[PDB]
Amino acid sequence: ALQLWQFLVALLDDPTNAHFIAWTGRGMEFKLIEPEEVARLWGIQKNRPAMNYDKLSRSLRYYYEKGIMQKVAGERYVYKFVCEPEALFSLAFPDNQ
């Protein structure tokens, strides 16, 4: 039941992953340094060997359209988590509401 956003946070928490995904240091902003590597690891997590970044980025778009993330303008692979009351509810309850 692991959400993509949770998987990304697990990768981001470990600084030894910073060569493919990293917190940028600007608040809750993060960068996919190697987008296809992030997607490969997500495919391993989900046992979906045909995973790729095209597919993973659909979920990033679903998250930013819902206001749980925002896509950073002028960047291709930079996103941020939203720090707002309503977004926190969604993060607290991915499986039941």
Side-chain angles (χ1 to χ4, degrees):
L2 186 69
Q3 286 275 316
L4 174 63
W5 76 257
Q6 292 172 297
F7 179 73
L8 297 177
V9 168
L11 293 178
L12 287 161
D13 195 61
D14 181 346
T16 71
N17 294 327
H19 56 288
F20 58 89
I21 190 175
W23 294 118
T24 67
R26 199 158 59 178
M28 306 298 292
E29 188 182 75
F30 62 97
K31 184 175 184 172
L32 296 96
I33 300 172
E34 297 297 349
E36 296 292 356
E37 179 66 6
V38 177
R40 188 184 71 84
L41 297 171
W42 177 234
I44 293 169
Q45 180 67 33
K46 287 292 188 179
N47 192 26
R48 294 175 191 161
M51 185 58 62
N52 57 41
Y53 189 69
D54 178 86
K55 293 165 173 182
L56 188 152
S57 68
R58 281 218 299 280
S59 285
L60 295 176
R61 180 162 187 164
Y62 289 132
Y63 288 139
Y64 72 70
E65 289 178 345
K66 286 296 175 59
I68 294 164
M69 292 180 183
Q70 291 184 305
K71 184 174 181 64
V72 175
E75 290 282 7
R76 304 262 286 99
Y77 307 108
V78 180
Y79 296 81
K80 66 181 192 177
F81 282 90
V82 169
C83 276
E84 297 179 3
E86 293 79 2
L88 180 60
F89 173 86
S90 300
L91 299 174
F93 293 107
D95 308 318
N96 279 319
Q97 299 182 5

